Amino acid sequence: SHMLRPVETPTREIKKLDGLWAFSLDRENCGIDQRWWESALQESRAIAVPGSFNDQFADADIRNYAGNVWYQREVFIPKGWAGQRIVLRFDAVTHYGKVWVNNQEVMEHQGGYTPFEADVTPYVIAGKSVRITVCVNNELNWQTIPPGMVITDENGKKKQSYFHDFFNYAGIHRSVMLYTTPNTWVDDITVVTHVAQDCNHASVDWQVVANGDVSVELRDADQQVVATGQGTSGTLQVVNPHLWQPGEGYLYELCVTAKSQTECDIYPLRVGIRSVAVKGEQFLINHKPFYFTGFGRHEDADLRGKGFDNVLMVHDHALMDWIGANSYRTSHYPYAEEMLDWADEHGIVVIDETAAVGFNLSLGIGFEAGNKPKELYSEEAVNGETQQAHLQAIKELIARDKNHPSVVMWSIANEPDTRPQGAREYFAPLAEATRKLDPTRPITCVNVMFCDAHTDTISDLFDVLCLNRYYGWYVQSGDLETAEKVLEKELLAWQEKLHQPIIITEYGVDTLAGLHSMYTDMWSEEYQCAWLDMYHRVFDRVSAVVGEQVWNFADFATSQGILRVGGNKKGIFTRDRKPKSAAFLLQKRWTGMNFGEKPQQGG
Amino acid sequence: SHMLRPVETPTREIKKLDGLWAFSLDRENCGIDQRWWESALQESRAIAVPGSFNDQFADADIRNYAGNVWYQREVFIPKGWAGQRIVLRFDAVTHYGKVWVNNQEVMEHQGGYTPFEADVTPYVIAGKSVRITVCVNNELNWQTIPPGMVITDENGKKKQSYFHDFFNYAGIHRSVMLYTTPNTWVDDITVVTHVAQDCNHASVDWQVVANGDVSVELRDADQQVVATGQGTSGTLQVVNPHLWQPGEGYLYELCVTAKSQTECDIYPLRVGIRSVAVKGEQFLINHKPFYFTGFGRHEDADLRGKGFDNVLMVHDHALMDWIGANSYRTSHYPYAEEMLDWADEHGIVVIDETAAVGFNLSLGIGFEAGNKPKELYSEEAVNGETQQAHLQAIKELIARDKNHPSVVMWSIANEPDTRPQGAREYFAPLAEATRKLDPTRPITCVNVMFCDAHTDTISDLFDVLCLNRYYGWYVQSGDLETAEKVLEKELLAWQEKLHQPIIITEYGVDTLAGLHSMYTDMWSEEYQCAWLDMYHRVFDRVSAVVGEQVWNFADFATSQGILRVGGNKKGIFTRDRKPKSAAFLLQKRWTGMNFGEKPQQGG
Ligand SMILES: COc1cccc(NC(=S)N(CCO)Cc2cc3cc(C)c(C)cc3[nH]c2=O)c1
Ligand SMILES: COc1cccc(NC(=S)N(CCO)Cc2cc3cc(C)c(C)cc3[nH]c2=O)c1
């Protein structure tokens, strides 16, 4: 369906993020049968929203729980909301939600990183209290967007396994809200900026609408009406403009009016005049040779999970700004939109990514019981549904982020195994369909190191080359000397194979803060520094390398294992954001360069 | 008396350092009355020598023990030792030892950092076993060289307090040995190298001798006899030579022969042709403008105490060599001679220091019960004995180290309070007497920051200016900005006051390895780096500054207190010798310079 980011004019919101809700586990899965949502959850306790449920209670049994949990809370609908449109919206519900307003089932959602909403006017009465009950599921299976497998034990209980690193946080991770609309209402919008050698340029509106006529007006930074359009379906305004750029990120505001003889609906959609596409081995934003810096990130932090948080947000960006990141990627799931609004506002370049992670079964590291399906693409394991579920996941992200100028690229998935058979048959359609959803931006699929330049059957189908590489770490462990060869050899081997522009979307080594070594070896701070030094030395000797993003901005939490010391320790910063000695090395390189500019194959 | 470093030709040793001795505490102090040394200590256990007794057992009760402890062990005297001179030697016994060979009291010593020996021939029989019993005392009082105070509690037990930082380790910290001499024997030697504008030069022998005639011969590096002298009392040989220098440290060997008609005694005394003295604001070794780098060190390490250790020794020097130290100081006590032999051999410059530390009562940091004597120099507190005990401590160090070329300076004490009254009356005699013991080297007394350039009543009496300064740390805590002013202001204020050459013998900040901060504040690694940066920026803007030695090479152990987090954390390295991020900053500065060379008031 249609997603529009709420803002506040002929519409206003009660955020329900007001944190404390009633909470409970349903270890018997008797909750739907016993119709829990008709009265107050019993045996509950306070929980905060937004945040993951897992770590709020310091309890392993809750942390590793799998199945359904219940959220409940009450809330007076504002008196002024008349006969108006009342709309309940969740920015995310991690993995799956079902919603009961008093007794009315109003909503259902699968996907954990994108919004869903419903018109609730008929079971609500403005000026009165209404119960809100949410049922939340955190289970993953094969047609799910990260896939996974729930093993039920003989003894009654579930237990989740899956194929990615990062830990399976679940819950209401983002803002909920009740919001208000006129019965005339904008409900969809799309916008495209074309650029021309940097002198002048044009933007297209298209806009689905609740019944009404659209006056479309584009405003200055200073609110001077410099673009006007008529029509409820389409326009193009060719004004000679001020562009969205990386150092600075200028933005226009396109108000959107939908009219009836009774009503009016007014919408400001921030807009960045920017063009994105690839030319040969170059990446082009406003027809310029960019160079990417920054990291893969996660939504992870002590206590809250992947739960959204303003302070955290403000601090991390301060940190990225300081250290010279111009860009980052939404590692392995759609992030809360606020990050993107900030990126636009601040001109930060974003490779936007779907939750399609862990399609891979070789990854890995198993001393344990094998199964585990034999064929990756099978009706058993990655199947028809799964391509369809996956398709739907790509719609939504694009539905949400097409209008965010900061997004210069889409990412279809991260590290799928492309050595098994259906791997090109699975990936070709979605690659086509992606561009049929948005042809304004290039599209990639992020590449695991064992589908290497001679074995990977999928890369031509995409526009840019996104590599995750560990050459001294998982292989050649500890050996910078031979690691540098393999890496360059393999970067050159990609350059000729595909003659595409190359970005390393993951390069990094586990490092324990405070571990220091005169022998400069694995897990030491010094080693991280030497290893990043080297990867760097090597992108300076390759023309096709136009992007660099460090494995992890900060240490995050993982599934429990032998290869993870209390989590992934590959952060430049610790989880509480204290900088490892490598923050200061990246500091120099990233602020020493010219903005958006590769070195002189040296410096 | 006379000290000569054993080496092995007409003399040979059984080191008795063979570690495991029998050990016990004497909590009743009934040990001498009950004549423990007549039979095997009872209720004993194995202990290793050399090492401190305190930490070998992981026991707090033994670690904090005060009083007498007993060492005992047996050892066959070598058959070949005939009617020869048999000589028992201890390189150190920390604080005080008394020694019983079977029942014969052979020895007594107060001082913990210098050798003492005795002729044991008459109570020993070559080819047989003999008991060795040592009584060791670790108590400090006012006439002791570090001074201190033992409070006996009402309940029966002692408890030591004292006035220095470093922890009161005690025990047999260095090699013991039985050694052999002919009845003709060299027993004393002294040597002085004069240098002349770098073309040619002369060395004086003087030598006390067991009865016999001395042939004195100086050899090449390659054992070619290039200097010869006759006389059992004095010579000078003027040969045109190859000098002892800091980068490289060349050495000659002067054999020493003492003759009888029955016997011959042969002694090689390594000799470095080098001149040391001050000229104006310059420090001169072989008439050159030196610049000092390196640290204050301690004899401290996990498990062993201040006990000597070859591996430790080899590793630390590797570390100093790597990081650019050309020099160091024997912080607050005479070190094991092996360090000095190594320094000569490797050309490393050494400010040699006595155990005279803690003369100061203002230092400090007391929330607790005051007393504590009112007048520092009094018959109560630092008194006539104390100047005499102190005098004796200076003899011995000079007795031991006069022949070590690596020692370019003597240090009389460290951080005494010179604001109370007797402070110039106490210090003037020893300053005079020092030069009457060795006029070949300059002499200093190390200066605490609160006897500052306007208040310190003692500095003219010495040759070089040795300052310990903490300007952002103990005062101006955390404030590099104002700390830099005070420091420079106070360095200039010294330069004019005395127009002597200045060395900072202590500059450093407590730093926890692994503590990282974006705010670059106290106890963080980054702070240490900024603070050392700054002290440095400031010696580059002062002409009189010709020496820099970092507070601590590595973290050491201290007395328990509120200001010490498991010890002094001011090491560039942790106690297990892992480098803090500041090892790499000092690295650059120390190897970036020209050898022995201050920068161009810049670089
Ligand atoms: C199931 O969730 C978990 C749990 C714990 C660890 C991981 N590891 C992950 S995601 N990575 C991917 C790094 O981008 C490490 C990894 C690399 C790897 C490389 C090669 C060349 C081979 C042959 C096998 C490999 N196996 C691996 O596991 C995943
Ligand atoms: C008794 O054994 C201990 C136990 C614990 C700590 C110490 N501290 C020592 S030796 N230092 C000397 C540093 O070279 C720190 C120290 C500095 C200081 C400076 C000023 C200006 C004043 C007024 C008072 C001060 N007091 C101090 O204690 C000694």
Tab-separated table of N, CA, C and O and ligand atoms in Angstrom, chain B residues 162-166 332 357 360 362-366 414-415 419 448-451 468-470 473-475 506 551 558-564 568 570, ligand 2:
chain	number	residue	atom	x	y	z
B	162	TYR	N	55.780	4.479	55.874
B	162	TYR	CA	56.926	5.183	55.311
B	162	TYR	C	56.427	6.275	54.384
B	162	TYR	O	55.227	6.452	54.229
B	163	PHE	N	57.347	6.956	53.709
B	163	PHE	CA	56.988	8.187	53.009
B	163	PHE	C	57.125	8.206	51.474
B	163	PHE	O	56.769	9.192	50.822
B	164	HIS	N	57.587	7.102	50.897
B	164	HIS	CA	57.601	6.970	49.442
B	164	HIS	C	56.428	6.160	48.899
B	164	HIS	O	55.702	5.472	49.627
B	165	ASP	N	56.290	6.252	47.587
B	165	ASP	CA	55.194	5.696	46.828
B	165	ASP	C	55.304	4.184	46.751
B	165	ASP	O	54.492	3.424	47.304
B	166	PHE	N	56.325	3.779	46.000
B	166	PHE	CA	56.644	2.394	45.735
B	166	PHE	C	56.523	1.519	46.968
B	166	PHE	O	56.770	1.980	48.078
B	332	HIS	N	65.104	5.963	42.980
B	332	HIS	CA	64.966	5.872	44.430
B	332	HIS	C	65.609	4.663	45.106
B	332	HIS	O	65.192	4.260	46.195
B	357	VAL	N	65.018	8.663	49.898
B	357	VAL	CA	63.758	9.052	49.320
B	357	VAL	C	62.862	9.179	50.535
B	357	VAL	O	63.062	8.484	51.532
B	360	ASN	N	60.600	13.736	53.182
B	360	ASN	CA	59.613	14.769	53.046
B	360	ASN	C	58.388	14.352	53.823
B	360	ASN	O	58.014	13.177	53.791
B	362	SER	N	55.433	16.465	53.878
B	362	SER	CA	54.299	17.186	53.320
B	362	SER	C	53.611	16.301	52.292
B	362	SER	O	52.469	16.543	51.890
B	363	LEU	N	54.335	15.259	51.903
B	363	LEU	CA	53.960	14.349	50.842
B	363	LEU	C	53.555	13.013	51.441
B	363	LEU	O	54.369	12.091	51.486
B	364	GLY	N	52.302	12.875	51.864
B	364	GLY	CA	51.250	13.833	51.601
B	364	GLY	C	49.924	13.095	51.549
B	364	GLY	O	49.861	11.915	51.913
B	365	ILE	N	48.874	13.797	51.116
B	365	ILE	CA	47.530	13.230	50.915
B	365	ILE	C	46.772	12.571	52.084
B	365	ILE	O	46.139	11.529	51.902
B	366	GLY	N	46.817	13.192	53.261
B	366	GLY	CA	46.402	12.557	54.507
B	366	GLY	C	45.022	13.068	54.916
B	366	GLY	O	44.808	14.274	55.104
B	414	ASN	N	65.909	12.146	46.356
B	414	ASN	CA	64.784	12.457	45.499
B	414	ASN	C	63.658	13.038	46.332
B	414	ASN	O	63.160	12.405	47.263
B	415	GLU	N	63.282	14.268	46.007
B	415	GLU	CA	62.103	14.915	46.585
B	415	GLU	C	62.081	15.105	48.112
B	415	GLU	O	61.064	14.859	48.751
B	419	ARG	N	61.852	23.151	52.708
B	419	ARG	CA	61.207	24.339	53.250
B	419	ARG	C	61.412	24.422	54.768
B	419	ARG	O	61.554	25.520	55.315
B	448	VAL	N	61.177	18.107	44.260
B	448	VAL	CA	59.719	18.026	44.326
B	448	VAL	C	59.069	19.372	43.995
B	448	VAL	O	59.573	20.432	44.365
B	449	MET	N	57.934	19.328	43.308
B	449	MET	CA	57.365	20.535	42.708
B	449	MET	C	56.933	21.620	43.689
B	449	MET	O	56.733	22.775	43.290
B	450	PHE	N	56.771	21.283	44.964
B	450	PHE	CA	56.351	22.336	45.891
B	450	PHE	C	57.490	23.097	46.555
B	450	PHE	O	57.268	24.066	47.275
B	451	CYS	N	58.711	22.646	46.298
B	451	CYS	CA	59.899	23.433	46.584
B	451	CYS	C	60.102	23.865	45.157
B	451	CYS	O	60.693	23.152	44.332
B	468	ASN	N	61.030	17.086	39.148
B	468	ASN	CA	59.881	16.224	38.984
B	468	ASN	C	58.640	17.104	38.931
B	468	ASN	O	58.298	17.745	39.930
B	469	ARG	N	57.963	17.158	37.785
B	469	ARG	CA	56.833	18.088	37.657
B	469	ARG	C	55.535	17.482	37.132
B	469	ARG	O	55.549	16.638	36.225
B	470	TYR	N	54.424	17.954	37.707
B	470	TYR	CA	53.096	17.378	37.488
B	470	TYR	C	52.448	18.748	37.533
B	470	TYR	O	52.308	19.331	38.612
B	473	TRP	N	48.322	17.424	36.388
B	473	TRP	CA	47.880	16.396	37.301
B	473	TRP	C	47.598	16.457	38.808
B	473	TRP	O	46.594	15.923	39.270
B	474	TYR	N	48.449	17.121	39.576
B	474	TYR	CA	48.266	17.126	41.024
B	474	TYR	C	47.660	18.530	41.257
B	474	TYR	O	46.771	18.731	42.099
B	475	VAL	N	48.133	19.492	40.477
B	475	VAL	CA	47.563	20.827	40.445
B	475	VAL	C	47.226	21.179	38.999
B	475	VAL	O	47.871	20.689	38.059
B	506	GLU	N	61.138	13.544	36.282
B	506	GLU	CA	59.802	12.936	36.354
B	506	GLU	C	58.728	13.820	35.708
B	506	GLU	O	58.459	14.931	36.194
B	551	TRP	N	57.959	9.800	33.698
B	551	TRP	CA	57.612	9.138	34.939
B	551	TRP	C	57.408	7.976	34.038
B	551	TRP	O	57.373	8.046	32.806
B	558	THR	N	52.418	-0.013	44.681
B	558	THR	CA	52.565	0.954	45.761
B	558	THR	C	51.908	0.482	47.065
B	558	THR	O	51.134	-0.496	47.121
B	559	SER	N	52.249	1.200	48.125
B	559	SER	CA	51.465	1.247	49.360
B	559	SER	C	49.976	1.359	49.030
B	559	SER	O	49.622	1.967	48.020
B	560	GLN	N	49.095	0.765	49.834
B	560	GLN	CA	47.657	0.848	49.527
B	560	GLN	C	47.161	2.270	49.863
B	560	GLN	O	47.462	2.803	50.938
B	561	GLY	N	46.401	2.886	48.959
B	561	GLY	CA	45.840	4.208	49.203
B	561	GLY	C	44.746	4.634	48.225
B	561	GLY	O	44.518	3.986	47.219
B	562	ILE	N	44.091	5.752	48.536
B	562	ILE	CA	43.051	6.377	47.719
B	562	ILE	C	43.570	6.977	46.425
B	562	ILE	O	42.784	7.265	45.519
B	563	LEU	N	44.866	7.272	46.371
B	563	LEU	CA	45.423	7.933	45.198
B	563	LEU	C	46.106	6.927	44.273
B	563	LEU	O	46.627	7.296	43.218
B	564	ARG	N	46.109	5.655	44.664
B	564	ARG	CA	46.800	4.627	43.881
B	564	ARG	C	45.848	3.498	43.500
B	564	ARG	O	45.438	2.705	44.345
B	568	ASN	N	50.867	2.531	41.180
B	568	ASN	CA	51.058	3.722	40.377
B	568	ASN	C	50.785	3.351	38.916
B	568	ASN	O	51.479	2.501	38.364
B	570	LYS	N	51.238	5.269	36.290
B	570	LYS	CA	51.931	6.220	35.399
B	570	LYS	C	52.915	5.626	34.409
B	570	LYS	O	53.771	6.335	33.858
C	2	LIG	C1	53.518	8.275	51.407
C	2	LIG	O1	53.700	7.635	50.119
C	2	LIG	C2	52.814	8.067	49.166
C	2	LIG	C3	51.569	7.437	49.026
C	2	LIG	C4	50.664	7.860	48.057
C	2	LIG	C5	51.010	8.917	47.227
C	2	LIG	C6	52.253	9.550	47.346
C	2	LIG	N1	52.496	10.557	46.507
C	2	LIG	C7	53.651	10.992	45.997
C	2	LIG	S1	55.195	10.314	46.420
C	2	LIG	N2	53.556	12.015	45.143
C	2	LIG	C8	54.770	12.632	44.559
C	2	LIG	C9	54.761	12.603	43.034
C	2	LIG	O2	56.107	12.765	42.551
C	2	LIG	C10	52.202	12.537	44.844
C	2	LIG	C11	51.876	13.769	45.702
C	2	LIG	C12	52.107	15.006	45.082
C	2	LIG	C13	51.855	16.199	45.746
C	2	LIG	C14	52.084	17.424	45.125
C	2	LIG	C15	51.829	18.619	45.803
C	2	LIG	C16	52.087	19.964	45.110
C	2	LIG	C17	51.345	18.586	47.111
C	2	LIG	C18	51.065	19.887	47.886
C	2	LIG	C19	51.116	17.361	47.729
C	2	LIG	C20	51.364	16.169	47.051
C	2	LIG	N3	51.126	14.948	47.693
C	2	LIG	C21	51.374	13.743	47.025
C	2	LIG	O3	51.144	12.699	47.644
C	2	LIG	C22	53.159	9.130	48.323
